[PDB]
Amino acid sequence: SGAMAALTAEHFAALQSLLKASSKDVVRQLCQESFSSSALGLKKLLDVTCSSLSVTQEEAEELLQALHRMTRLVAFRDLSSAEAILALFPENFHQNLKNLLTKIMLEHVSTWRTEAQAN
């Protein structure tokens, strides 16, 4: 329990793998797929994640778990301002990656919150 209370050190470490992405669009799509997927269904995204980011299977799994948690937390708590989302992050997390993730959360939170709160 408390899954929605915080992202863990392992989550934040895993999200840093997104700096290997070849474009911002890859990050966007990984956020959307990780949200829509159940945690137990994230294994279905491993091959495309490994192949797109050139990461290990373990890096991909940890990343996908982190994105799944972050996007669900944003939806569950209705974190719908940059202020609210920025509050999740450590000071020692890459600033422009954080800003990108915040941007992407804001692009989807209204739809995500509706989808999640319906279920």
Side-chain angles (χ1 to χ4, degrees), residues 37-42 45-57 59-68 70-105:
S37 184
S38 279
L40 62 75
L42 292 170
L45 299 163
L46 278 174
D47 288 342
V48 63
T49 301
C50 289
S51 296
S52 65
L53 300 179
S54 300
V55 291
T56 67
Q57 188 183 34
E59 278 176 323
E61 181 63 27
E62 292 182 358
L63 171 61
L64 289 164
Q65 292 284 351
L67 288 172
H68 175 81
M70 178 176 280
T71 60
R72 291 302 183 89
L73 183 160
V74 160
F76 176 79
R77 291 172 54 185
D78 193 13
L79 306 183
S80 54
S81 66
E83 289 90 331
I85 295 156
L86 289 167
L88 301 175
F89 287 82
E91 308 160 58
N92 55 15
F93 187 99
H94 193 269
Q95 294 290 342
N96 280 340
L97 177 59
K98 174 177 71 186
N99 291 347
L100 175 63
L101 288 171
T102 300
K103 183 177 186 70
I104 298 167
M105 301 303 97

Side-chain angles (χ1 to χ4, degrees), residues 14-30:
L15 290 169
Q16 290 160 41
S17 291
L18 294 164
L19 284 152
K20 301 184 85 281
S22 285
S23 69
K24 293 181 176 183
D25 192 75
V26 170
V27 179
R28 289 193 157 86
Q29 297 299 314
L30 284 172

Side-chain angles (χ1 to χ4, degrees), residues 4 35 71-72 75-76 110-116 118-119:
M4 303 295 199
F35 175 83
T71 60
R72 291 302 183 89
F76 176 79
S110 70
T111 296
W112 285 348
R113 167 153 188 84
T114 298
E115 287 174 332
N119 303 279

